[PDB]
Amino acid sequence: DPIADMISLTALQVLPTAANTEASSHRVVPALQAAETGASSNASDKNLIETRCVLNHHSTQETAIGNFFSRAGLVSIITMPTTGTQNTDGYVNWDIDLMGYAQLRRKCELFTYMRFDAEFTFVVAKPNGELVPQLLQYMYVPPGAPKPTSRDSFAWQTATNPSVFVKMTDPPAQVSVPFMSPASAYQWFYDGYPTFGEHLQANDLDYGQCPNNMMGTFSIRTVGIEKSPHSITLRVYMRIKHVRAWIPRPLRNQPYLFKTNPNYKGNDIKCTSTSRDKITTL
Amino acid sequence: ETGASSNASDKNLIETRCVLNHHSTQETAIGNFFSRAGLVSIITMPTTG
Amino acid sequence: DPIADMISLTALQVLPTAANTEASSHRVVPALQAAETGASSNASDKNLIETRCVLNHHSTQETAIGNFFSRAGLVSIITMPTTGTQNTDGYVNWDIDLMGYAQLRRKCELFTYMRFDAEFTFVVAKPNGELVPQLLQYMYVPPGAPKPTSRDSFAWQTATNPSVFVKMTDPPAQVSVPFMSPASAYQWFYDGYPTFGEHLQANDLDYGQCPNNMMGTFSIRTVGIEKSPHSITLRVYMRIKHVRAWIPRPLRNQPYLFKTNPNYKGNDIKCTSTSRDKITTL
Numbered sequence A, C: 001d002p003i004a005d006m007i008s009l010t011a012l013q014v015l016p017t018a019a020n021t022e023a024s025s026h027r028v029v030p031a032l033q034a035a036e037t038g039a040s041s042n043a044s045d046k047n048l049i050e051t052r053c054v055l056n057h058h059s060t061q062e063t064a065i066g067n068f069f070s071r072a073g074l075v076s077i078i079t080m081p082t083t084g085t086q087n088t089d090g091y092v093n094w095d096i097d098l099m100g101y102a103q104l105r106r107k108c109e110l111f112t113y114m115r116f117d118a119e120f121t122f123v124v125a126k127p128n129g130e131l132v133p134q135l136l137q138y139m140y141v142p143p144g145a146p147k148p149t150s151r152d153s154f155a156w157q158t159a160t161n162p163s164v165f166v167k168m169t170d171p172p173a174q175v176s177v178p179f180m181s182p183a184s185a186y187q188w189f190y191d192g193y194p195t196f197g198e199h200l201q202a203n204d205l206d207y208g209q210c211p212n213n214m215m216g217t218f219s220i221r222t223v224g225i226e227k228s229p230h231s232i233t234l235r236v237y238m239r240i241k242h243v244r245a246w247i248p249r250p251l252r253n254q255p256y257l258f259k260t261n262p263n264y265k266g267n268d269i270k271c272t273s274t275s276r277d278k279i280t281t282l
Numbered sequence B: 001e002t003g004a005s006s007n008a009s010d011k012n013l014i015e016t017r018c019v020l021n022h023h024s025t026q027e028t029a030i031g032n033f034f035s036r037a038g039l040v041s042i043i044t045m046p047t048t049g
């Protein structure tokens, strides 16, 4: 008491259908905007022209981020060939990174942060699309859990990790996954480094790598002591569900080159829009 | 020396802020820890051997 | 509200006379003290011996700091000789520093800070004690005011500074002075430097100098266009009044050497107490 110096405006609204149009006539300066402020023109039809009444029942439900994202998309293709350089071992460990396929990636990168649960579907077959009576095991190996070093590895005992056993002939396996980041949300962009220290050019592959997005390894194998005679192709589809998103940003307008960064082909910088001869001719 | 674990917490050794902690303890319930199918046996019936 | 971490025991007493003594008998451990704490024994007569009742009316009024300090003491001796090296000029400018005389100085240095008003008395005469019909002018020249450069100096016009005109034959001149420091109190000890910068050995005379104690200059002259034939001796006495004091400290036990610092003769360090031959003999 003996010292006197020690004593968000915007909100939501539910709009199920597009706004309507009201009538007006031959009649305050609402046509000229001060776009220098960083605001979008609040001028509508009724201001610049004479209008009729239109009872607009067009629905806005399909543009809800949920209907936009909750569509299963390809995020990975894993192959286990029998003859070659890949894995004549009968098993494969895949670091989880969903940024290897553009269609989905570009959609997510529309936002800076995203939080959601997901439905993963596992479509498996031979490289030509044929199916055979082969038993498989998919296992989720969280960060810290021991990764299988072979098709015989004890890790396939899967006493605590979650594993799925399914035949290549059964329908696609399918499961639900919760929001697992240790942060409040996954983030497609992390303008920083994961650790302290000097950031010499040798460790610049560190830039942009966010541990909170690193969900571990996904392992798969044929279930047998002996090698399987079949080459295997596994396509993993992901369907986002129960999603929330923050901070929209410009959409990628240059082809993707790498999973972990926004590097672009500097010699061939594509223009966002097609070109024409003259500004006065279509 | 008694065989007891320190009943001293944050508020005792340092100045703290109020934190409304909603972290759930359901996953460490022995049921969620054990109710995960695990391999307990491998039985083989070969034809030649 | 959305954050929960953002939401003197001793007093005075009036004792006009010394505390009394009450009776006791042949009877809790009040004789043994824990002086390790930094406390003075709260054990009195009634605890260590059998006592009688004594109605003690001894007064504590004389030990009040006011009666202790409000006794005029010599703080300066200013001389204006006619034949010599001093001031055959007829005027003198004296920087005000009251630390040139021990009796008073030691008393004040009992405290660290002191605030008070004062009564200055000016006893003037010839060097042999004789008096003559000589007119004098004493003037207070505050910091910033122009100091007289001669007996004719315009500064003696004293249009704003306060001046006193008195004859060497009139009784001593006497005036009251207010508490003039720009600080809350004068301080006999200032453990620091007056300005910023490096404190090279060339400017070490700065250490301990506190501007808040520098009250300016005291000027005096004979009132005449012509030189006076009389040597003059001025003794200035000061009587502290309306005083308050803080933070008592050890009393000087070494002879004073300089006005502005506590330097002491290192080769001859005096013991606070006289000595004897044996610790078992008086």
Ligand SMILES: CCCCCCCCCCCCC/C=C\[C@H](O)[C@H](N)CO
Pocket: A096, A097, A098, A099, A118, A120, A138, A139, A140, A162, A163, A164, A175, A177, A180, A186, A188, A210, A213, A214, A215, A218
């Ligand atoms: C037995 C079923 C196993 C299925 C387990 C799959 C868990 C996958 C969790 C989805 C994690 C979202 C992706 C997060 C971050 C991005 O990939 C990062 N940019 C990679 O550094």
Ligand SMILES: CCCCCCCCCCCCC/C=C\[C@H](O)[C@H](N)CO
Pocket: C096, C097, C098, C099, C118, C120, C138, C139, C140, C162, C163, C164, C175, C177, C180, C186, C188, C210, C213, C214, C215, C218
């Ligand atoms: C015409 C009458 C003129 C009389 C004016 C006398 C004013 C003197 C004010 C008393 C100041 C107290 C002394 C203060 C500080 C000490 O002298 C310091 N240690 C000096 O550096």
Ligand SMILES: [Cl-]
Pocket: A156, A157, B039
């Ligand atoms: Cl096994």
Ligand SMILES: [Cl-]
Pocket: A066, A067, A070, A240, A241, A242, A243
């Ligand atoms: Cl959703």
Ligand SMILES: [Cl-]
Pocket: C156, C157
């Ligand atoms: Cl004059």
Ligand SMILES: [Cl-]
Pocket: C066, C067, C070, C240, C241, C242, C243
């Ligand atoms: Cl007083």
